[model samples]
Target: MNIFEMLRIDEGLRLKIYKDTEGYYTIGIGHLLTKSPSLNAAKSELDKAIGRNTNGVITKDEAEKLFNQDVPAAVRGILRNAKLKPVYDSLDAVRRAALINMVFQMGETGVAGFTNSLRMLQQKRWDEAAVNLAKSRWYNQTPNRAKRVITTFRTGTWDAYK
Candidate 1:
């Protein structure tokens, strides 16, 4: 699947605010309401998207708007990274989708922190990349999604997408 569709499942949707695994105030499709850009901005954006003050709730369509809006920046963040760009360009669609999925969950900076894993990815060393993925706190924090991402890296197939 494409990155956006994959992220829709990975991030999940919540019409109301809920705490993320990190206990941050998240809403919509993994939107961190507590993060910067001010809560007012998020509130205003949500209101604008849904055409009303939604209080703490938003609609699926509105969440889609936010999700679409959010993914481009995340994608640009990854593509603009000098160290990651060449590696990302070398990967096939499945592997690149896996990378973008990881960046969607954790910022490109966090994904780049997997120095050894990313190096293996550049070299097309799938097995070694899988090994490195297991060493992260992210792997343990989001075990199911992490496994799928790691396996996608290893198999270079859309099997994980199934």
Candidate 2:
């Protein structure tokens, strides 16, 4: 029902929590040493990422004091705005969420660089889409994460919502 609940993250933090696939060093919008800059930077960075990822129509207070663990809410807002134009045209909620999750992880320039993946996904080429999902700097750099999400896309059973 809540973002933290959705993410399965602990409550009472002031930032999002991104962990290694092993759940190490939970990073988010604010780290104690750089909380100030991290928050502002995250706010600006996330807004720009969402706007560019979905062509605008979504915005959030980077300084939101609530739901600190729920970074996906910001991403979901992007999907919501995207739905205004029927970008929700895809029949597979998992694939759609997977693409947006990639966008959230990789940011605009990072995601835009995935020309092959984008094409495969847009054309509904499921196998190729899954393959392309593995062929990214993201995948190369974070193999564990890539594998995790690819499994989700491939099986549609690794529900982030659950």
Candidate 3:
């Protein structure tokens, strides 16, 4: 299914899904999908998912933590099921993190709305991608958000790396 199909954000600015450890399924914006085991668990999960260690942000461990499962066991489950790999391949590290942050707040269907711009990124059409990115209803919603992503795309660089 398409990203928008997965996430259906409406004009009222409410997300159609829940974003929690049940794997960020679909919950509305800024509403904790559910109480996390602990704040540290949430932070740690965010760190691992959104920060270093590889190409993409977020792992199945984070998902499981959000889901209230054991970390180590979740790691094993990740390997067994290839849970987060697809998302990892689908976006650059920066975009992935931003997307994660966006979805975490906006919900799955909200992030799914990005499919139009994402399509441009997939084809490496940087300029068009930037335009599409800026055209979003969320474009100016989060100034830094869209700006940062668009800057990276327009420059063909990410985090000034490489």
Q: For residues 1-162, what per-residue lDDT tens digits would candidate 1 score against the true structure?
A: 688878878888898866787776678888766654455666665566667888768878878888887888777888899878888899998888898888888887888888888898999989988998899999898899899889999998878768
Model 1, clash count?
Answer: 0
Off by over 4 Å in 2: 1-88, 159-162
**lDDT tens readout by residue for model 2, 63-124:** 23223433655455545553211332453766555555555454444565667766666666
- Candidate that scores best on TM-score: 1
Model 1 sits at a Cα RMSD from the real structure of: 2.7
Off by over 4 Å in 1: 36-52
Encode model 3's per-residue lDDT on 1-162: one tens digit a residue: 222211222111222333443343222222343356454454454445435432223444444333332222323332343333344356665544444444444555565557776566666687888888888766766555557646756664455222
Candidate 1: residue 129 lDDT (0-100):
85
Q: How close is every model to the real structure, measured as TM-score?
A: 0.87, 0.51, 0.41
| lDDT, candidates in the order shown | 0.82, 0.48, 0.46
True lDDT of residue 160, candidate 2: 39
